Structures are given as C-alpha cells and as structure tokens.
JSON list of C-alpha atoms in Angstrom, two decimals:
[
{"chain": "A", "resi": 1, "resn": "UNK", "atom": "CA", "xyz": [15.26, 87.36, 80.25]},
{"chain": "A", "resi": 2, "resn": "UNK", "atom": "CA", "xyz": [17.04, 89.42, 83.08]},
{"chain": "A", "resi": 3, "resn": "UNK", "atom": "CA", "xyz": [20.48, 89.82, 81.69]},
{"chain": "A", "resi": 4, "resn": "UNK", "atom": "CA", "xyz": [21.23, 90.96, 78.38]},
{"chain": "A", "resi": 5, "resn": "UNK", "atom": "CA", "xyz": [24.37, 91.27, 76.52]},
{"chain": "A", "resi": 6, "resn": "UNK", "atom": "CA", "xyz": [24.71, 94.45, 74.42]},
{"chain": "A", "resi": 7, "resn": "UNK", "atom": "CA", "xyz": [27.83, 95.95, 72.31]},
{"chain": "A", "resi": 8, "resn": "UNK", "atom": "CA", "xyz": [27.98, 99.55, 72.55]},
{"chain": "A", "resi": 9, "resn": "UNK", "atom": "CA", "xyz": [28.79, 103.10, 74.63]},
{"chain": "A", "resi": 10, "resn": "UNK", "atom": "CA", "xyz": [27.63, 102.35, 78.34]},
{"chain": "A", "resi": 11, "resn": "UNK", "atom": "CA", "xyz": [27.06, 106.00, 78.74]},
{"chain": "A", "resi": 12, "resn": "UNK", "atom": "CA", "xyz": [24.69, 106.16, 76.20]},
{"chain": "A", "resi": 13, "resn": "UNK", "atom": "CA", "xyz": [21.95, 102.98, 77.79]},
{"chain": "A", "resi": 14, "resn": "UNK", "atom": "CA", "xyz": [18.84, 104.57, 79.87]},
{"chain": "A", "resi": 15, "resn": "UNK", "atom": "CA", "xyz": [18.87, 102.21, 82.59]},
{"chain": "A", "resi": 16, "resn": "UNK", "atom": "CA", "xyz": [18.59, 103.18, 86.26]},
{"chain": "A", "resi": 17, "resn": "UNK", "atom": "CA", "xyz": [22.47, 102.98, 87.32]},
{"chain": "A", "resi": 18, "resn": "UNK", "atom": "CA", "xyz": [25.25, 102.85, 85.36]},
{"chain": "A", "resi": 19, "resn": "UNK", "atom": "CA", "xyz": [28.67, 100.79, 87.30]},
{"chain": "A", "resi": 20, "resn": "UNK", "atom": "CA", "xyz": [31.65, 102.92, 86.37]},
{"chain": "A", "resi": 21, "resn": "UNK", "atom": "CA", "xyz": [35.03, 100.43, 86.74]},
{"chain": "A", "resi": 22, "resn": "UNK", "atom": "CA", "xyz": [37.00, 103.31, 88.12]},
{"chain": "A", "resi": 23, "resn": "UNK", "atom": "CA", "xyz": [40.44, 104.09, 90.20]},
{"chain": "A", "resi": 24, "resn": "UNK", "atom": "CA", "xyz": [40.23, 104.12, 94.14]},
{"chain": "A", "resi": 25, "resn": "UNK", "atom": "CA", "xyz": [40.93, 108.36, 93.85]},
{"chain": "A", "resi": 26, "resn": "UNK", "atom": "CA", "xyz": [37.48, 108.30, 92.54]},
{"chain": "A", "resi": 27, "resn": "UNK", "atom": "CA", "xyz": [38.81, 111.39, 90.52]},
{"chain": "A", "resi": 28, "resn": "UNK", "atom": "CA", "xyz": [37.99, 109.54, 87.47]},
{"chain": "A", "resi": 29, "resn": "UNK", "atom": "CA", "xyz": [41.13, 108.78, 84.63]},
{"chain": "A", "resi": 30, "resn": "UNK", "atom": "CA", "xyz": [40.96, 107.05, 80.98]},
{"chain": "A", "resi": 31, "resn": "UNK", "atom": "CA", "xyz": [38.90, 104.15, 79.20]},
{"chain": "A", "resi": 32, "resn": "UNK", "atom": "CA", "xyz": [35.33, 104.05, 80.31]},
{"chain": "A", "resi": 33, "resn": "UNK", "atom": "CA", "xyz": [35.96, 105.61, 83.41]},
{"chain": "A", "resi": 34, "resn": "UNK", "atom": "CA", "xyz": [37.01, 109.14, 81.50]},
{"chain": "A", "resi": 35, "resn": "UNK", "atom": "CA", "xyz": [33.96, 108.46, 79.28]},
{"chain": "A", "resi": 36, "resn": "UNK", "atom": "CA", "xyz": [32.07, 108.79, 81.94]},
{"chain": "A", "resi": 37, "resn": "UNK", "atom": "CA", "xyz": [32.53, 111.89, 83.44]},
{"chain": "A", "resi": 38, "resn": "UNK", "atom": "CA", "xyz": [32.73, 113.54, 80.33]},
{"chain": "A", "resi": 39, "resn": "UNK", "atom": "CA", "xyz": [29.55, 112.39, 79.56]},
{"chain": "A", "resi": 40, "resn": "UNK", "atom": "CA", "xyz": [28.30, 113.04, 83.20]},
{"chain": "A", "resi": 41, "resn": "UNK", "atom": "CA", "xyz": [29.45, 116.30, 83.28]},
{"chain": "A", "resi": 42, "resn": "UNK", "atom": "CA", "xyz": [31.48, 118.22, 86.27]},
{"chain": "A", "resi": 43, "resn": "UNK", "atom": "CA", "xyz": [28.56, 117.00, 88.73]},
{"chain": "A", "resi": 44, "resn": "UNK", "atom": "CA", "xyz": [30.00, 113.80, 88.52]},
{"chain": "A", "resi": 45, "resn": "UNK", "atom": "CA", "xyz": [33.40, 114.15, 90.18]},
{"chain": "A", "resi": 46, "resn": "UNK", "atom": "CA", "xyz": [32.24, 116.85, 92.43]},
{"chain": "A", "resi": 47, "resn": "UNK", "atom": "CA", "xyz": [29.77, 114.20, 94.38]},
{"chain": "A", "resi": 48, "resn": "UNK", "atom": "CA", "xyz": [32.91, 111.80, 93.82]},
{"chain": "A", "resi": 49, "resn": "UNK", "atom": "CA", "xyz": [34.93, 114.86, 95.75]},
{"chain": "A", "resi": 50, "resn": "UNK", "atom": "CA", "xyz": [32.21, 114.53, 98.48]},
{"chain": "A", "resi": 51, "resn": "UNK", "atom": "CA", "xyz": [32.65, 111.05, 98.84]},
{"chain": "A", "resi": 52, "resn": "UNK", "atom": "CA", "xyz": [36.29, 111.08, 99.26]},
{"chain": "A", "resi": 53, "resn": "UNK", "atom": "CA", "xyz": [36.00, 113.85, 102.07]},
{"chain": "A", "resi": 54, "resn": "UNK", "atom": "CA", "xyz": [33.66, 111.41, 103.66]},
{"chain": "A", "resi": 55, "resn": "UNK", "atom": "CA", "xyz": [35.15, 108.45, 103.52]},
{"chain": "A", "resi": 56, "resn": "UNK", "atom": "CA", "xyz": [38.89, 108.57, 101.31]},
{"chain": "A", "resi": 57, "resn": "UNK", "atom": "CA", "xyz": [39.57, 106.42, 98.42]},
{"chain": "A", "resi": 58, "resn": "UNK", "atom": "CA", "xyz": [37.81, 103.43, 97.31]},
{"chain": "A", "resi": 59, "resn": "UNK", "atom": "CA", "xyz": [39.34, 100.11, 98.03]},
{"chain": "A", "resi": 60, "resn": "UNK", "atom": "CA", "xyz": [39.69, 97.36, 95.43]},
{"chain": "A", "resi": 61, "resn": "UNK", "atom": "CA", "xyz": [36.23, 95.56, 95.55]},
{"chain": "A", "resi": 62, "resn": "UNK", "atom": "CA", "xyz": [34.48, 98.40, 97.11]},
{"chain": "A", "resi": 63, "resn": "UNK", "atom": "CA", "xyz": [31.85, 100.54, 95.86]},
{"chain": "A", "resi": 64, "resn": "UNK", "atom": "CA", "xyz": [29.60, 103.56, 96.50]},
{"chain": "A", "resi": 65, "resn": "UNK", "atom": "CA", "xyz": [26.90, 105.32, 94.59]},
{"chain": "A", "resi": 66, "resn": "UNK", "atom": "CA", "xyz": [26.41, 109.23, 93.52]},
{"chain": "A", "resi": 67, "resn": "UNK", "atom": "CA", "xyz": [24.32, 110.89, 91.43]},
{"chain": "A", "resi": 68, "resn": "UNK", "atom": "CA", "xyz": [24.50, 110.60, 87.31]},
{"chain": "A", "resi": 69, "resn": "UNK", "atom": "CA", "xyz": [24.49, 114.17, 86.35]},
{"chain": "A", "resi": 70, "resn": "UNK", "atom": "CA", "xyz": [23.99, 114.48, 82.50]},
{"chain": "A", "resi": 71, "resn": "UNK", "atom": "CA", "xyz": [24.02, 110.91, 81.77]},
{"chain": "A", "resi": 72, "resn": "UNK", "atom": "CA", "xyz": [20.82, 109.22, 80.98]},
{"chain": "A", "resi": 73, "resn": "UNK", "atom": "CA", "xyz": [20.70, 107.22, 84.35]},
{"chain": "A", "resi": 74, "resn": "UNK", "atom": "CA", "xyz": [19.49, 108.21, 87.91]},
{"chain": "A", "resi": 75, "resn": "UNK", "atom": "CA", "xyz": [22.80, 107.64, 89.41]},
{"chain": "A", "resi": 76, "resn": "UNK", "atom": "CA", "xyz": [26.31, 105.91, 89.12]},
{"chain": "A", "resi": 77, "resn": "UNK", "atom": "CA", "xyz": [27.89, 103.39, 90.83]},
{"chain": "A", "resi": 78, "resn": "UNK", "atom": "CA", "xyz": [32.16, 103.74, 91.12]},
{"chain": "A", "resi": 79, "resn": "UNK", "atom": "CA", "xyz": [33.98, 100.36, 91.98]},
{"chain": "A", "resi": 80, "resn": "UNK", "atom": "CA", "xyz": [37.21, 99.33, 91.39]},
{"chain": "A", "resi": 81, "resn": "UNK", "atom": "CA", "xyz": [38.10, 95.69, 90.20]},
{"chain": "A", "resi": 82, "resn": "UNK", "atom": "CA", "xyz": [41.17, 94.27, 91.16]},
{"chain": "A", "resi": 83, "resn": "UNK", "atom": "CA", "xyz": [44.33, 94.68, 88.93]},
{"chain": "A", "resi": 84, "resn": "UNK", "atom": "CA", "xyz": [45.49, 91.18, 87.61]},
{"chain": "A", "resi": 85, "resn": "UNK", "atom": "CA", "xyz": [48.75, 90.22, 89.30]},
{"chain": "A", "resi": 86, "resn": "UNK", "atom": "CA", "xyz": [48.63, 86.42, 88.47]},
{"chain": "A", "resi": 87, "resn": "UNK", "atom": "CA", "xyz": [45.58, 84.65, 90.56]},
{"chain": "A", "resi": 88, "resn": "UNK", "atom": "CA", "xyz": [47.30, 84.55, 93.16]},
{"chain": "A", "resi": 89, "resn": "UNK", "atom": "CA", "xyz": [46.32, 87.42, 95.12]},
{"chain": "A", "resi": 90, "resn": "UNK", "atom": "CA", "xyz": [42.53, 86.94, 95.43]},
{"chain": "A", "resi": 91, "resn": "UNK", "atom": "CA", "xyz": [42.27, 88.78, 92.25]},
{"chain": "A", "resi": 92, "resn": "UNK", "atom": "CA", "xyz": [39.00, 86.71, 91.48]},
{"chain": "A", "resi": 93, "resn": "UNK", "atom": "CA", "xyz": [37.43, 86.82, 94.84]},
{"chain": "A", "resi": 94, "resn": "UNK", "atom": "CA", "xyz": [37.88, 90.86, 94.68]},
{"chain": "A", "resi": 95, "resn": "UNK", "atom": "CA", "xyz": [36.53, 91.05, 91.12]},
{"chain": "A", "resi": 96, "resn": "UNK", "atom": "CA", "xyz": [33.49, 89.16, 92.50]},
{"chain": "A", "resi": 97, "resn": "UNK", "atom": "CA", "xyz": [33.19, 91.47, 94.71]},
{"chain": "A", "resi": 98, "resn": "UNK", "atom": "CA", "xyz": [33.17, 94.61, 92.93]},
{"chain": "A", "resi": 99, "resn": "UNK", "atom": "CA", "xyz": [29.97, 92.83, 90.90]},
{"chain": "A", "resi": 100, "resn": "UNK", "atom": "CA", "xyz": [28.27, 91.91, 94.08]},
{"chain": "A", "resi": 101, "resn": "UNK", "atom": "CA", "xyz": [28.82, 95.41, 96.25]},
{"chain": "A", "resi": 102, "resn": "UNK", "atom": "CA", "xyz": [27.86, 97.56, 93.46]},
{"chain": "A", "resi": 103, "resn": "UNK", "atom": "CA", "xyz": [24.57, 95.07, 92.90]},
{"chain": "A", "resi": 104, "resn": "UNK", "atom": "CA", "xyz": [23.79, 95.21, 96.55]},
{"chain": "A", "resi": 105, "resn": "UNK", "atom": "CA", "xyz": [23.83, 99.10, 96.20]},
{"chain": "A", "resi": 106, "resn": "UNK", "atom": "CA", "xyz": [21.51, 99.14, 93.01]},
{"chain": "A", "resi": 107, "resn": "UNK", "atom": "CA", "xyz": [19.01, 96.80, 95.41]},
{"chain": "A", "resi": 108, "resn": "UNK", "atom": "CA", "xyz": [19.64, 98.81, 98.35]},
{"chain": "A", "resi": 109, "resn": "UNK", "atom": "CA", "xyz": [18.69, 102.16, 96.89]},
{"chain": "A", "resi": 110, "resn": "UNK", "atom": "CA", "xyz": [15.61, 100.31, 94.99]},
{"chain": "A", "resi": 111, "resn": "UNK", "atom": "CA", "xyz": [17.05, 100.56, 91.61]},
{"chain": "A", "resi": 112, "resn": "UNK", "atom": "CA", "xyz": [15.29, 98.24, 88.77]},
{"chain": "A", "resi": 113, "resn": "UNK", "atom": "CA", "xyz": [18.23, 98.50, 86.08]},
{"chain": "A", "resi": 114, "resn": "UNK", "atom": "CA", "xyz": [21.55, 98.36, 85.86]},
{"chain": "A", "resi": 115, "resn": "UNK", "atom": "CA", "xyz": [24.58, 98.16, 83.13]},
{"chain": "A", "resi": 116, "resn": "UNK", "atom": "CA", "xyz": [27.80, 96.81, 83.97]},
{"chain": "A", "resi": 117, "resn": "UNK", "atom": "CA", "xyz": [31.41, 97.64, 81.89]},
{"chain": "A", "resi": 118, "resn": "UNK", "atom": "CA", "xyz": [33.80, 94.50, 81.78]},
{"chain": "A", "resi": 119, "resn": "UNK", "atom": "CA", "xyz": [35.55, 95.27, 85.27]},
{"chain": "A", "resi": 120, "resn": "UNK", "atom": "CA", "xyz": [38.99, 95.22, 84.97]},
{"chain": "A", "resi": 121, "resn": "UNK", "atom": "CA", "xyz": [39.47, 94.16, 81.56]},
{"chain": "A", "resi": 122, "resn": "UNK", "atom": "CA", "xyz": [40.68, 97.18, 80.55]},
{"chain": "A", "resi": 123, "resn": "UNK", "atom": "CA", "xyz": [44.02, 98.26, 81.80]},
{"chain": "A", "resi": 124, "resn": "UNK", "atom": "CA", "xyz": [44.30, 96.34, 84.77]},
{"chain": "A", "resi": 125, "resn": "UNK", "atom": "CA", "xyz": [44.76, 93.28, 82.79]},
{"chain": "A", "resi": 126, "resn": "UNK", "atom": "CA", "xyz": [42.48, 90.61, 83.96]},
{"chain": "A", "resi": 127, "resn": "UNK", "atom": "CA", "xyz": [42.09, 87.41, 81.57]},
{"chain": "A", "resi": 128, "resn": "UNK", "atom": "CA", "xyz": [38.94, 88.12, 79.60]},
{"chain": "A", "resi": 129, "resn": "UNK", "atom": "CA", "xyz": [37.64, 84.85, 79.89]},
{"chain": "A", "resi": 130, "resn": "UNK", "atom": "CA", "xyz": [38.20, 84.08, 83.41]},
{"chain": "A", "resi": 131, "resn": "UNK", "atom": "CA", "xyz": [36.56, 87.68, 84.07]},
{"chain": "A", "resi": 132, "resn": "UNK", "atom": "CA", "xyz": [33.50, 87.17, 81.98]},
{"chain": "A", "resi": 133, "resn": "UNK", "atom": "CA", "xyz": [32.83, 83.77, 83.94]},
{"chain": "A", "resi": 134, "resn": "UNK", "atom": "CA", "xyz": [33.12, 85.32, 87.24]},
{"chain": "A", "resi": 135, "resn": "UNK", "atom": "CA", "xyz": [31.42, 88.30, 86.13]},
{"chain": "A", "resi": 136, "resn": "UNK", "atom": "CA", "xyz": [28.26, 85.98, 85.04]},
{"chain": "A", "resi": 137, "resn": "UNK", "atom": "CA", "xyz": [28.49, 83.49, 87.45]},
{"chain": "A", "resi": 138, "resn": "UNK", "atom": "CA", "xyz": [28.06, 86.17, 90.27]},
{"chain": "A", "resi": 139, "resn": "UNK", "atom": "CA", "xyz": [25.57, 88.07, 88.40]},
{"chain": "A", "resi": 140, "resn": "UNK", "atom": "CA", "xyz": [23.43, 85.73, 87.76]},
{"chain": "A", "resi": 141, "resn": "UNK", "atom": "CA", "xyz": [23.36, 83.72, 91.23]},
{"chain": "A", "resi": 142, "resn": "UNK", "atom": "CA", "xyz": [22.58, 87.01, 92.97]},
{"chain": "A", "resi": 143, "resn": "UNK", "atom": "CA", "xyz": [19.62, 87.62, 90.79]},
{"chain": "A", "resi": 144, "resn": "UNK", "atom": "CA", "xyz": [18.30, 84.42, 91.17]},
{"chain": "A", "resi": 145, "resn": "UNK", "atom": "CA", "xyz": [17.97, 85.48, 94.87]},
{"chain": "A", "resi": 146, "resn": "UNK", "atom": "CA", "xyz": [17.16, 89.46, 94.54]},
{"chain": "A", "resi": 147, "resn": "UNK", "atom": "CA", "xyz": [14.23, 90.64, 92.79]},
{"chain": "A", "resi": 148, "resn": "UNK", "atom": "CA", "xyz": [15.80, 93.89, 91.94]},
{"chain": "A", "resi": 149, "resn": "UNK", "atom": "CA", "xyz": [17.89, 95.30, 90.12]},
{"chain": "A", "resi": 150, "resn": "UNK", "atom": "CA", "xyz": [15.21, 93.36, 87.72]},
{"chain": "A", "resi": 151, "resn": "UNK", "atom": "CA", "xyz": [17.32, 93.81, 84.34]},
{"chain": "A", "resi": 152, "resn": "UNK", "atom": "CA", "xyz": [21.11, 93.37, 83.90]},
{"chain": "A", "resi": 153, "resn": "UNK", "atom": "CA", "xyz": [23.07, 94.64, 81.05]},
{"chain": "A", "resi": 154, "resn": "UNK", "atom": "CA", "xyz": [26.71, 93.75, 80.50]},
{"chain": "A", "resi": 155, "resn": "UNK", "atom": "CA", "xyz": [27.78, 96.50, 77.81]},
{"chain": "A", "resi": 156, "resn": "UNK", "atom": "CA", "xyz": [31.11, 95.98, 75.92]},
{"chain": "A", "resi": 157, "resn": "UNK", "atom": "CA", "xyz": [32.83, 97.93, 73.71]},
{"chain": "A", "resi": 158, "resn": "UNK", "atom": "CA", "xyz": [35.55, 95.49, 72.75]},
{"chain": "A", "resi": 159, "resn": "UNK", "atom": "CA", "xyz": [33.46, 92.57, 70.30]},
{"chain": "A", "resi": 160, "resn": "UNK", "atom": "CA", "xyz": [35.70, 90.22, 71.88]},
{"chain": "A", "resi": 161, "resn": "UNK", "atom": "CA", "xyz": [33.98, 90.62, 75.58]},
{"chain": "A", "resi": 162, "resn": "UNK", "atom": "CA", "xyz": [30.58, 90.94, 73.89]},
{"chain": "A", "resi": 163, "resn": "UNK", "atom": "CA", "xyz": [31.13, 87.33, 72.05]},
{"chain": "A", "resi": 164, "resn": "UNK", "atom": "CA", "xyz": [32.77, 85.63, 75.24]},
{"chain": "A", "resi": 165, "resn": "UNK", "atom": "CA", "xyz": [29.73, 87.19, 77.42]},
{"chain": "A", "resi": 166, "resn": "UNK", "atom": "CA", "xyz": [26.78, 85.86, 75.08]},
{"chain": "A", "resi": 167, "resn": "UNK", "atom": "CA", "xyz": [28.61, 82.41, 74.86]},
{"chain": "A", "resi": 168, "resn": "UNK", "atom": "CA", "xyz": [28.72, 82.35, 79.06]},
{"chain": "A", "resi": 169, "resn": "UNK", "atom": "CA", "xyz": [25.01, 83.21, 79.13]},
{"chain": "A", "resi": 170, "resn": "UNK", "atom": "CA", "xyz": [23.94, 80.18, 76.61]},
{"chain": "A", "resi": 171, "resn": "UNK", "atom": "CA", "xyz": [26.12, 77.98, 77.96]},
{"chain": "A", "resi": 172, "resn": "UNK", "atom": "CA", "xyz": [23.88, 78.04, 81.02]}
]
C-alpha cells in the first residue's frame, strides 16, 4: 500500500521528490535525465552548478538533493547508478546504493513521497530484471524500517520495466 507501480512521464507525478538517474557532472544529458531539466527549468542545473562548486561531481552510488524548480515536486534528488560492466564490479551493490542514499535523503529532509526512474536501465545497460529485483528488494526493506518517505512510486516509461516491477511486487 506504500509502493506503487505506475507507467508514465516521472516529471509529470506530484509527489514530494522526484530521483533523477543522472551523470556524475550533474550538468544533466539525455533520457530522463534531459527530461528533467527541461521540465525543471534553468533553476535546476544552476543549484546542480552550486553543488558541484561545493562538492565536484557525483560518484556512482552517491546522491544529493536541490530544489525542483518548475516541476511539480518540492525538490529533486540526482544519483547516479552504476554502468553495467558484467557483475563483476559491484555493479549491484552500487545500484543498491543509489536507491538507498537518495531514500535516506527523502527521510532526512522529512519528505513523505517519492518517485523513482529505473536507475540505470537506460543507457548504462544494467539487466532489467536483475535491476528491478534489487531496486525492490532495497526499497521495500528500507521502508519496512523508515516511516517516511511514506509512499514509493517506481515510474517507467518502457512497459517492459513497468510489467517486470508489478510482477516483483506480487511476488512478495
């Protein structure tokens, strides 16, 4: 009743903080990411300009919050999930990661909601099923031990992620 599933333009959900799966410049590039800045507006990558000042690019894993600008969220969360290079290289430990520092921000800054894109399925190549599991899996354990954020919302835009993500969430 805390995690939902929904097919559709993450930049277009009102939900407290939206996860961008974005490149360690931070300077935001194509795929979701580009979506949303655009969407965002030039407020977006001029906090993002601020962070980078403060503390450089963002390491695989890693994240840090800004504001939202124009999108219809009170602020944005930028990670970066790793890029797949076999399984060999902790790939699923740092995609874990990305889900579980950019959830510890949303309860850190008391945030109730939050929508997650399918980190690292995009370009960076990770095996959609394996990162749906993991994605899940961490999800879900570290809401059965936080009370916020209170809601959870993976949002895909490929069907095939949306399908594999309600499957993980029954088969529970």
């Amino acid at each position: 009743t805390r995690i939902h599933v929904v097919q559709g333009d993450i930049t277009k959900l009102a939900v407290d903080v939206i996860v961008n799966a974005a490149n360690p410049s931070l300077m935001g590039g194509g795929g979701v990411d580009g979506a949303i800045h655009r969407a965002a507006g030039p407020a977006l990558l001029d906090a993002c300009l601020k962070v980078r000042q403060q503390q450089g690019d963002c390491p695989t894993g890693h994240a840090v919050i800004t504001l939202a600008g124009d999108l219809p969220a009170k602020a944005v969360v930028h990670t970066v999930g790793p890029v797949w290079r076999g399984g060999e290289q902790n790939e699923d430990q740092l995609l874990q990661d990305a889900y579980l520092n950019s959830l510890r921000l949303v309860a850190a800054n008391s945030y109730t909601s939050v929508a997650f894109p399918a980190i690292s399925t995009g370009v960076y190549g990770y095996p959609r099923a394996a990162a749906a599991e993991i994605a899940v899996k961490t999800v879900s354990e570290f809401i059965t031990r936080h009370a916020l954020p209170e809601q959870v919302y993976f949002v895909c835009y490929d069907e095939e992620n949306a399908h594999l993500y309600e499957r993980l969430l029954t088969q529970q």
